[PDB]
Amino acid sequence: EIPLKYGATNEGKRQDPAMQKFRDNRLGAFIHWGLYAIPGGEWNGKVYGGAAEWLKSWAKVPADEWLKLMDQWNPTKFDAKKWAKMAKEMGTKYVKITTKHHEGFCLWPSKYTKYTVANTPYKRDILGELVKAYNDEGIDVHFYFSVMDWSNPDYRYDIKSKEDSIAFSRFLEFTDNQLKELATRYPTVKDFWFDGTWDASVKKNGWWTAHAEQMLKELVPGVAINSRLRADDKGKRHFDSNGRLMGDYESGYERRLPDPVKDLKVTQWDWEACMTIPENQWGYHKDWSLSYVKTPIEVIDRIVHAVSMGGNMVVNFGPQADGDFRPEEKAMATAIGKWMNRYGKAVYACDYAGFEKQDWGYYTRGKNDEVYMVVFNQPYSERLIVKTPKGITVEKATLLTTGEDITVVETTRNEYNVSVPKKNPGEPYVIQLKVRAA
Numbered sequence: 001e002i003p004l005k006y007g008a009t010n011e012g013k014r015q016d017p018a019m020q021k022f023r024d025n026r027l028g029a030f031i032h033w034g035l036y037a038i039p040g041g042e043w044n045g046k047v048y049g050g051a052a053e054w055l056k057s058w059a060k061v062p063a064d065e066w067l068k069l070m071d072q073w074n075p076t077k078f079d080a081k082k083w084a085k086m087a088k089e090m091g092t093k094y095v096k097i098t099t100k101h102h103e104g105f106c107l108w109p110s111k112y113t114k115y116t117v118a119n120t121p122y123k124r125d126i127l128g129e130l131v132k133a134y135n136d137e138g139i140d141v142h143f144y145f146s147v148m149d150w151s152n153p154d155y156r157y158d159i160k161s162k163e164d165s166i167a168f169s170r171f172l173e174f175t176d177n178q179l180k181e182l183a184t185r186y187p188t189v190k191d192f193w194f195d196g197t198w199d200a201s202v203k204k205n206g207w208w209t210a211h212a213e214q215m216l217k218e219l220v221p222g223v224a225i226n227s228r229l230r231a232d233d234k235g236k237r238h239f240d241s242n243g244r245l246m247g248d249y250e251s252g253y254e255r256r257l258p259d260p261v262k263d264l265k266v267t268q269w270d271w272e273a274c275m276t277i278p279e280n281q282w283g284y285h286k287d288w289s290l291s292y293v294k295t296p297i298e299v300i301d302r303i304v305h306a307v308s309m310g311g312n313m314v315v316n317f318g319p320q321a322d323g324d325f326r327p328e329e330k331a332m333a334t335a336i337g338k339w340m341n342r343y344g345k346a347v348y349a350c351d352y353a354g355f356e357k358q359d360w361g362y363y364t365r366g367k368n369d370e371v372y373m374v375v376f377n378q379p380y381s382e383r384l385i386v387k388t389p390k391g392i393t394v395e396k397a398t399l400l401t402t403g404e405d406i407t408v409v410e411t412t413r414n415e416y417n418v419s420v421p422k423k424n425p426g427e428p429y430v431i432q433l434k435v436r437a438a
């Protein structure tokens, strides 16, 4: 036991209603929108292959010159009601929005910096319009916030001098000012998802990360805070020096997921994965031919994979500079929504089922002991193997969409073949099991 002032504050999962809501939502969308959408990964005739939102770094653009992109910020096709409609039709239950990325441009009219939407031709409070429109559709809003800020010359990557320490202290005050402003201007916010907290400067000021968590929790009742914000007294991140999760949920599975056999430890805490459609582009990049682009079924597999292991999944969108979505993203959101409309009873408010993983897909468990089989890989044998935990038996199987009864055959003690449906559903599909405990 290492004594810590700024280590973990929760013991186990939060079970207050706000955390239950964060969890039951399960499926979210991410929006990365900022000045990087304007060049879209290209600078002065070179298209950079790195993530578009990092183009300032790839093209070595000085801050003043990068931030002059504000003069081009005029997304005339933006309509927050249309964005909220697209999210609703996709089946998302919440949206995480970049309030400010590393570049430091704010999507709300901050009084603490001139680098904001207010000082662009468009003028309007994008973040405020989104909060209202998403909330009008019943969709929760979460705020992404980058602590690292390339627009503020008080930022420091490490503290190597008295002057660095004074500057970084001013930087933390500026950061607190913005965070309090977000929390009070948009009091329906349900979560702060911090990024840009990996530098030595933040690791040496773990106390500040704990402070920011506590400050936001006092301002916004029931607010969630991600693990990535948090460093302990020793500079240890996400999990403290005693191995305890800091913040309210683990937020490290970013473009990767826990193994369904080897990583069952994740079922012990809340967690949220986020993923990009291309291999590694969050902000708008004009050239999606540069890396592999996931198909809708690949995305749906990841969504179900997360819920099957007790986690949420957030699918990223990088809107165009004009305020509309690219056709690949409109197609993705539509295809996800069509699937979720049909099969979402096996996703929303579901969790880890405690069954041995099988090759056909994933199990999820509903709030009333329903066990859903979500089938992604159709066996040529036309039999879906179900091995039940000790004392659990399968009483019935039903095809979710039609309610048709599915034959269940016991093959050995604790093992069944559940028949595939008489007609191949032609897409990933759900069979609902009625199970009984000894």
Ligand SMILES: Cc1ccc([C@@H]2N[C@@H](C)[C@@H](O)[C@H]2O)cc1
Pocket (backbone or CB within 6 Å): 032, 051, 053, 054, 195, 254, 274, 282
């Ligand atoms: C190494 C690395 C740094 C920052 C990131 C940022 N976090 C993602 C959620 C995006 O915002 C990406 O810019 C990703 C990888």
